[PDB]
Amino acid sequence: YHGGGSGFGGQLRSWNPPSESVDAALLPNFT
């Protein structure tokens, strides 16, 4: 595909969401 890779001329070039478990993405700052 094309959307997920880099984006239209940079676009979201630096956007790198760290795919993790929902607990790994919620529990740290859960409180």
Binding site: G7, G9, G10, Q11, L12, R13, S14, W15
Partner: protein, 67 residues
């Protein structure tokens, strides 16, 4: 003679803007007057001369954007 004339022009700009663009000179029995130029024109002349000259980078191709 690009480098020579560019350096000469820069030095002329420096002395002119500080104190030393001799407008006219008179010694009793004789006098001459060198014409006076602006400063923005001299600066843009300097800029075009240097970008024409084989010196290093001075400009950048616009700019991009990214989140």
């Amino acid at each position: 003679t690009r480098q020579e004339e560019l350096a000469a022009a820069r030095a002329a700009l420096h002395d002119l803007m500080t104190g030393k663009r001799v407008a006219t000179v008179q010694k009793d029995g004789r006098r001459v007057e060198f014409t006076a130029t602006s400063v923005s024109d001299l600066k843009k002349y300097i800029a075009e001369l240097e970008v024409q000259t084989g010196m290093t980078q001075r400009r950048r191709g616009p700019a991009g954007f990214y989140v």
